[PDB]
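I hope you will forgive my troubling you with a question about protein structure. Here, with my thanks, is the record as I have it:
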Amino acid sequence: GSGSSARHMVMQKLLRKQESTVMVLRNMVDPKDIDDDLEGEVTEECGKFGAVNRVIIYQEKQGEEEDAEIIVKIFVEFSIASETHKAIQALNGRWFAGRKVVAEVYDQERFDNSDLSA
């Protein structure tokens, strides 16, 4: 005890494997901003934080109505969780023009299932 299991890295590799590598950026851009370049722009930018596996842009309806508002959610899956956390530290809480940036870890299992609703 008193640090011996940690010195032997006990269960670290499994814990690491279970860490999500997915970041979600919530309501950072508006629907008009989504063009054939956005995914690429986000990919390139996030290379300042890590190796990027893929990016998904999702226009989520808030309500069931024809005119329900949309919230844009941008998902960035990094190669390793440490990268995800560097990105979040650099992005979360910033002002993007007049929008405060919300950058958070997104559940890996949801993401892997294409459940982009949380």
Notes: The chain has one domain: 20-107. Residues 49 and 90 are 9 Å apart (CA to CA). Strands lie at 22-26, 52-62, 69-78, 95-96, 99-100, 102-106. The domain at 20-107 is CATH 3.30.70.330 (Alpha-Beta Plaits).
